[PDB]
Amino acid sequence: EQYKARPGIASVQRATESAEMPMKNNDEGTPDKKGNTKGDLVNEHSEAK
Amino acid sequence: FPEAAVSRIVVHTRWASNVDFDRDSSVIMAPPTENNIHLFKQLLNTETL
Numbered sequence: 432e433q434y435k436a437r438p439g440i441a442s443v444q445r446a447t448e449s450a451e452m453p454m455k456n457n458d459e460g461t462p463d464k465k466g467n468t469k470g471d472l473v474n475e476h477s478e479a480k
Numbered sequence: 481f482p483e484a485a486v487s488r489i490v491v492h493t494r495w496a497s498n499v500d501f502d503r504d505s506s507v508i509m510a511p512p513t514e515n516n517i518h519l520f521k522q523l524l525n526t527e528t529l
Contacts, residue, residue, distance in 0.1 A: 435529045 488512060 459470040481487065493506045509516055521528060 433529045435527070437527060 461469055463469050488511060490509050490511060492508050507519075509519065
């Protein structure tokens, strides 16, 4: 059998890999091992902008 | 008529003609012992590998 699938297997597989990615970890503002908050000294509103 | 063990009928537009101007759109088939699949895949068989 000589079957060429449309959409292609390779093209679909590449796209699904990107969607497989779990979201990043937003640990800013939380304490640390010794109890100090993790992050940089930037204003609360200016950080969002 | 041909003198043979088996005879068959085939369609061949203008197989015996003497025209002055050619319309240049003809239908020719081979004898049934040869493949004729190319006549049925001219319109939308753009994905047939």
